[PDB]
DNA sequence: CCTTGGCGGTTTTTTCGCGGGGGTCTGCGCGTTCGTGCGTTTTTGCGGTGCTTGTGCAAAAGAGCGGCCTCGGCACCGGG
């Protein structure tokens, strides 16, 4: 989740960026208010410990 | 120093003695009944507590006020 909220929204945070390749799913995102702000990890991604 | 006990002599009189007479009352003994001890069983006044009680500690946009800027024009002051 990206905690940018609804107030002061902008299109740039919601967009699918080039650097998202391989780390988050390009297709899976909710509809409506949270579109683009909620992301799903790709199927081979990890988080450093 | 002056008096109030003491020591003596004498008289008073009842203490006390022996004797008597009487009756009271204390003690023995019998009969008993009721009074208290002894018992298993029980209570009121009180110690400790329950629970009822309550009071305390994030964009964008326009608008507005604000302070300041500038300026002109006036008025007090000057030259002459």
Helix (H) or strand (E) segment spanning residue A14: helix A11-14
| Separation between Cα atoms, residue A29 and residue A35, nearest integer Å | 6
Cβ A46 to strand B below 7 Å: no
Under a CB-based contact definition with an 8 Å cutoff, are residues A20 and A27 in contact?
Answer: no
From the alpha carbon of A7, which nucleotide's C1' atom is closest?
A: B58
In chain A, residues 4 through 23 whose Cβ sits under 7 angstroms from any atom of nucleic acid strand B:
5, 7-8
Beta bridge partners of A24: A41
Experimental method: cryo-EM
Beta bridge partners of A36: none
- Report in angstroms the alpha-carbon separations of A42 from A13, A32, A33: 19, 22, 22
């Amino acid at each position: 989740n990206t905690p940018i909220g609804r107030d002061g929204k902008l299109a740039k945070p919601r967009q699918l960026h080039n650097t998202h390749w391989g780390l988050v799913c390009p297709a899976e995102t909710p509809e409506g208010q949270a579109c683009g702000l909620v992301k799903n990890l790709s199927l081979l991604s990890g988080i450093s410990i």
